[PDB]
Write an enzyme that holds these catalytic residues in place. Structure first.
Site, PDB file in Angstrom:
ATOM      1  N   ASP A  79      -9.996  -9.802   8.538  1.00 57.86           N
ATOM      2  CA  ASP A  79      -9.104  -9.946   9.089  1.00 57.86           C
ATOM      3  C   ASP A  79      -8.833  -8.418  10.571  1.00 57.86           C
ATOM      4  O   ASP A  79      -8.391  -7.044   9.873  1.00 57.86           O
ATOM      5  CB  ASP A  79      -7.439  -8.485   7.779  1.00 57.86           C
ATOM      6  CG  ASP A  79      -6.485  -9.211   8.304  1.00 57.86           C
ATOM      7  OD1 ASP A  79      -5.925  -9.247   8.763  1.00 57.86           O
ATOM      8  OD2 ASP A  79      -5.584  -8.514   7.077  1.00 57.86           O
ATOM      9  N   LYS A 104      -3.417   0.205  -2.894  1.00 53.56           N
ATOM     10  CA  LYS A 104      -3.369  -0.576  -2.922  1.00 53.56           C
ATOM     11  C   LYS A 104      -2.533  -1.229  -4.217  1.00 53.56           C
ATOM     12  O   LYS A 104      -3.585  -1.670  -5.147  1.00 53.56           O
ATOM     13  CB  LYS A 104      -4.530  -1.971  -2.220  1.00 53.56           C
ATOM     14  CG  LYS A 104      -3.535  -3.237  -1.616  1.00 53.56           C
ATOM     15  CD  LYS A 104      -4.550  -4.255  -0.703  1.00 53.56           C
ATOM     16  CE  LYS A 104      -3.115  -4.823  -0.257  1.00 53.56           C
ATOM     17  NZ  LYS A 104      -4.864  -6.007   0.504  1.00 53.56           N
ATOM     18  N   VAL A 114       0.950  -1.332  -0.047  1.00 51.73           N
ATOM     19  CA  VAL A 114      -0.130  -0.598   0.274  1.00 51.73           C
ATOM     20  C   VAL A 114       0.918   0.892   0.006  1.00 51.73           C
ATOM     21  O   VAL A 114       1.767   1.693   0.928  1.00 51.73           O
ATOM     22  CB  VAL A 114      -0.942   0.106   1.563  1.00 51.73           C
ATOM     23  CG1 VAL A 114      -1.716   1.178   0.591  1.00 51.73           C
ATOM     24  CG2 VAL A 114      -1.810  -1.462   1.437  1.00 51.73           C
TER      25      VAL A 114
HETATM   26  C1  LIG Z   1     -12.169  -2.539  -4.387  1.00 50.42           C
HETATM   27  C2  LIG Z   1     -12.816  -2.455  -2.539  1.00 50.42           C
HETATM   28  C3  LIG Z   1     -14.225  -1.233  -2.725  1.00 50.42           C
HETATM   29  C4  LIG Z   1     -14.152  -1.692  -1.055  1.00 50.42           C
HETATM   30  C5  LIG Z   1     -13.876  -1.232  -0.118  1.00 50.42           C
HETATM   31  C6  LIG Z   1     -12.673  -2.623  -0.522  1.00 50.42           C
HETATM   32  C7  LIG Z   1     -11.902  -3.114   0.512  1.00 50.42           C
HETATM   33  C8  LIG Z   1     -11.047  -2.023   1.294  1.00 50.42           C
HETATM   34  O1  LIG Z   1     -11.075  -1.632   2.810  1.00 50.42           O
HETATM   35  N1  LIG Z   1      -9.655  -2.029   1.235  1.00 50.42           N
HETATM   36  C9  LIG Z   1      -8.512  -2.109  -0.280  1.00 50.42           C
HETATM   37  C10 LIG Z   1      -7.458  -1.850   0.358  1.00 50.42           C
HETATM   38  C11 LIG Z   1      -7.225  -1.113   1.612  1.00 50.42           C
HETATM   39  C12 LIG Z   1      -6.489  -0.619   2.198  1.00 50.42           C
HETATM   40  F1  LIG Z   1      -5.370  -0.338   1.201  1.00 50.42           F
HETATM   41  C13 LIG Z   1      -6.432   0.078   3.237  1.00 50.42           C
HETATM   42  C14 LIG Z   1      -5.306   0.676   3.939  1.00 50.42           C
HETATM   43  C15 LIG Z   1      -4.718   0.089   3.736  1.00 50.42           C
HETATM   44  N2  LIG Z   1      -3.381   1.662   4.660  1.00 50.42           N
HETATM   45  C16 LIG Z   1      -2.353   0.892   5.625  1.00 50.42           C
HETATM   46  C17 LIG Z   1      -3.990   2.707   4.902  1.00 50.42           C
HETATM   47  N3  LIG Z   1      -3.785   3.427   5.347  1.00 50.42           N
HETATM   48  C18 LIG Z   1      -4.295   4.662   4.862  1.00 50.42           C
HETATM   49  N4  LIG Z   1      -5.388   4.753   4.515  1.00 50.42           N
HETATM   50  C19 LIG Z   1      -6.373   3.719   4.213  1.00 50.42           C
HETATM   51  N5  LIG Z   1      -7.438   3.912   3.292  1.00 50.42           N
HETATM   52  C20 LIG Z   1      -4.813   2.166   4.197  1.00 50.42           C
HETATM   53  C21 LIG Z   1      -7.397   0.032   3.739  1.00 50.42           C
HETATM   54  C22 LIG Z   1      -9.089  -0.044   3.176  1.00 50.42           C
HETATM   55  C23 LIG Z   1      -8.474  -0.778   1.752  1.00 50.42           C
HETATM   56  N6  LIG Z   1     -12.649  -2.777  -2.262  1.00 50.42           N
END
Ligand SMILES: Cc1cccc(CC(=O)n2ccc3c(F)c(-c4cn(C)c5ncnc(N)c45)ccc32)n1
Length: 247
Positions: free
Chosen positions: A130, A34, A19
């Site tokens: 998770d 991501k 990420v």
């Molecule tokens: C394709 C899709 C649509 C809607 C929801 C999701 C699943 C989801 O909640 N995520 C998918 C990748 C992801 C994701 F990489 C983060 C994230 C990780 N880290 C370390 C972060 N730091 C700051 N802000 C963030 N949003 C994050 C958070 C949520 C994420 N999939």
């Protein structure tokens, strides 16, 4: 490709996949992006792509806002999400190691948002799988968000059946929620006291001061941590529990 063209990288936020924080050249906003290595086998790939289409439909106050998904050529899947704060829930608890810094109401209000996000998912036939403080976030406006999930670290918050590869249901999320509720209400002085106590709590051994101070939450947590998944309450039962009635 499109990533290096349309975005300016700022920093790696974490490495399931990787990420990155990055700024969109056109709209000048920063995002969490991501990047996952896409399966080579055609059937396994289609599984991932179906999960993406399902998640992209989700909209909830406790779910990180979604912006875009694309593939680049080995193939990489890119997922562009709203950038949350650098201080996750694990950090939040780390900087607050005294009772006075863990106000009952602030803690329950945090847990409640987590539980409501989880109930939403379950109601859609999805599960999180998770849940753990390092993967629970805050938006810039301080809304609590469950973290990354969907496409499949410490196993400390992981249910028995999920650790051992047994068949499992949405009840796995209930186990995680239980340990997070305890942890929210019970600050630790050291990292090692945290691990010593949490592993005891998994095994239904609680600190006496916790049971006396939080007799109702204690009973909730006891139930959520049943070794038998069938026995754990539904997320809706938890959200409706009296402990949360003081709004
Ligand atoms: C394709 C899709 C649509 C809607 C929801 C999701 C699943 C989801 O909640 N995520 C998918 C990748 C992801 C994701 F990489 C983060 C994230 C990780 N880290 C370390 C972060 N730091 C700051 N802000 C963030 N949003 C994050 C958070 C949520 C994420 N999939």
């Amino acid at each position: 490709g499109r990533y290096l063209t349309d975005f300016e990288p700022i920093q790696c936020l974490g490495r399931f996949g990787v990420v990155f924080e990055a700024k969109n050249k056109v709209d000048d906003c920063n995002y969490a992006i991501k990047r996952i290595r896409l399966p080579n086998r055609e059937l396994a790939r289609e599984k991932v792509m179906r999960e993406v289409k399902a998640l992209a439909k989700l909209e909830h106050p406790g779910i990180v806002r979604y912006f875009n998904a694309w593939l680049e050529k080995k193939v990489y899947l890119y997922i562009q999400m709203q950038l949350c704060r650098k201080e996750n829930l694990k950090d939040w608890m780390n900087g607050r190691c005294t009772i006075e810094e863990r106000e009952r109401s602030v803690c329950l209000h945090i847990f409640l948002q987590i539980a409501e996000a989880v109930e939403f998912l379950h109601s859609k036939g999805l599960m999180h799988r998770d849940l753990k403080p390092s993967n629970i976030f805050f938006t810039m406006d301080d809304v609590v968000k469950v973290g990354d999930f969907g496409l499949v670290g410490t196993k400390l918050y992981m249910s028995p059946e999920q650790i051992h590869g047994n068949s499992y249901s949405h009840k796995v999320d209930i186990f995680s929620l239980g340990l997070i509720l305890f942890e929210l209400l019970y600050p630790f002085s050291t990292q090692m006291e945290r691990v010593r106590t949490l592993t005891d709590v998994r095994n239904l051994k609680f600190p006496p001061l916790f049971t006396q101070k939080y007799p109702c939450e204690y009973v909730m947590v006891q139930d959520m941590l049943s070794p038998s998944p069938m026995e754990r309450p539904e997320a809706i039962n938890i959200i409706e529990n009296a402990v949360f009635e003081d709004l």
